[PDB]
């Protein structure tokens, strides 16, 4: 029992963390197999970051100018390329702590931990959501670039998140392994309109089935709704319209818990509509978001 | 910017995470050098949990008897022994993996890194506070007991908590490194008082700086307080008295910010009187207390 925002291990990704420094800037690189994975933007001055060209930028540069160092261990750069919004650092050795990866894209409302990281040193790990709006509301100071995101499947790691870019907002942006940005974000310094957010619906209902699940039953009622009905209601508070998709992923949850996805609903309903009378759930007290009905079936069996 | 409840990153405790058998029992232990600890009662049988006579439940065990697996390989266990509530495995080989380490015993109000394990195996990480009543509100099922809690001071891992036990009420009991319970816990199967917990004020200062560093700033007054009055308000809310040895750690931020202490204590004050009024801080509606002062300056900085 207990409840807690819990982030994966973060091993396998420690060992793939790697220090980029072209000129003057350093941020963090990714090295996978013979690959070191890095923000394009580590090619930038100051003076180029308002609307950097970086087919000419990274035409000045050569193998030799992408410094890269493993802590102890400096790797001999052999190719360079641009992927969209990352850089692909070809080096000489394969790094011997690759674990089994994928590269995934992920979706709007999934989570993932992400290792905070600075000069290619690991500082800090925890876990988010990607925003329905394609933005996360990390920690990240001048020098995290390059840290990344990721899930892991037993021994498979799926890095999704590359991180780039503070928004004037505070709010931060990033692309998958491919440099894809998420969003309609581009790697300059301009201010850049982030879409209207919502809340991640289906992962409310998942956290108020692991709060059922862990104690936490004071917001359960005598009620049910429908979808139409309870889409009003998100329609209202400004959460993601809930699907059959969505009902259908919380199915384990209502079927542990023996409480029907609608009459879930109807807690919620209540809780937009009266808000927690200052009471908690689960140690907070907001409707939190960050956890996906799978996460909350993982950390309530003790899957490893 | 951005402030996240950030875990150590995990890497140098997984490798140290091992799964200990004894009899029909499974739970983990920390394989350090030539030595594998783990709660003791990982000897106990169901019968046995009501008020185990562990001295003798010992006895009847032999080095063969645990069974120390390290994933795919196994340990030779060479010596046995009970210090507190730890069992102590001498094994024929040194860790690998052992990284430079410390066993230290925290303070309530301190915070550390949780490593969830089951079968020897990491499951997740996250950041939680030990309470000032020396229990740890976690997130652990059974099978996790042996599960570490630690911090990293960039090379070093001060290991300071082992998880034991659940309580009935839901929350969490262990022992330090030496097996000595934080607490007035013993490892039996009885319902045992936590004392009366109190919010960590000078935590909830920090966290309340780390706010104005980040931008959120509207919980500011015009008003001041002296540790006297902000103590009577304390203790009408169950809140840990501030001392000036509080005021004293709170003094990088105070200077960093330019706010002075006992400016932010009537902040505090007005939150603790007035509450939220349906407002966050850091995406909390709630005064978090699970940031120390040197956790808050860590993460604003960038330390690896
Ligand atoms: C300053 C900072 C703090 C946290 N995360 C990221 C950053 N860096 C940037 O946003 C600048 C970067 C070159 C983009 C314009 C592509
Ligand atoms: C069931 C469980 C779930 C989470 N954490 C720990 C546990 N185990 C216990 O509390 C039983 C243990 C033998 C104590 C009586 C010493």
């Known amino acids: 029992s207990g409840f807690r925002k819990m982030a994966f291990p973060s091993g396998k990704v420690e060992g ?23 923000p394009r933007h580590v090619i930038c001055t100051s003076e180029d970051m308002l609307n950097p060209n970086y087919e000419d930028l990274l035409i000045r540069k050569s193998n030799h100018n992408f410094l890269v160092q493993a ?9 360079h ?16 702590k690759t674990p089994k990866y994928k590269f995934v894209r992920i979706q709007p409302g999934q989570t993932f931990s992400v290792l905070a990281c600075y000069n290619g040193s690991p500082s800090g790990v925890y876990q988010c959501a990607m925003r329905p709006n394609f933005t996360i509301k990390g920690s990240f100071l001048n020098g995290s670039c390059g840290s990344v995101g990721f899930n892991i499947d037993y021994d498979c790691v799926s890095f999704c998140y590359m991180h780039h870019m503070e928004l004037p907002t505070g709010v931060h942006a990033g692309t998958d392994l491919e440099g894809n940005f998420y969003g309609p974000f581009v790697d300059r310094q301009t201010a850049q309109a982030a879409g209207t957010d919502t809340t991640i619906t289906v992962n409310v209902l998942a ?31 400004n959460y993601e319209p809930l699907t059959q998709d969505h009902v259908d992923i919380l199915g384990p949850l209502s079927a542990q818990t023996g409480i029907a996805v609608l009459d879930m609903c109807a807690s919620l309903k209540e809780l937009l509509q009266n808000g927690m009378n200052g ?19 993982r950390q309530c069996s003790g899957v490893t």
């Open 71 to 79: 802590g102890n261990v400096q790797l001999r750069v052999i190719g």
């Open 207 to 237: 956290w108020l089935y692991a709060a059922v699940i862990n104690g936490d039953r004071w917001f359960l009622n005598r009620f049910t709704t429908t979808l139409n009905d309870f889409n009003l209601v998100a329609m209202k508070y």
């Open 16 to 38: 793939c963390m790697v220090q980029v420094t072209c000129g003057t800037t350093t941020l963090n690189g990714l090295w996978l197999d013979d690959v070191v994975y890095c």
């Open 81 to 96: 390329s641009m992927q969209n919004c990352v850089l692909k650092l070809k080096v000489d050795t394969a790094n011997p």
């Open 279 to 297: 009471r908690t759930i689960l140690g907070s007290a907001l409707l939190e978001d960050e956890f996906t009905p799978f996460d909350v079936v």
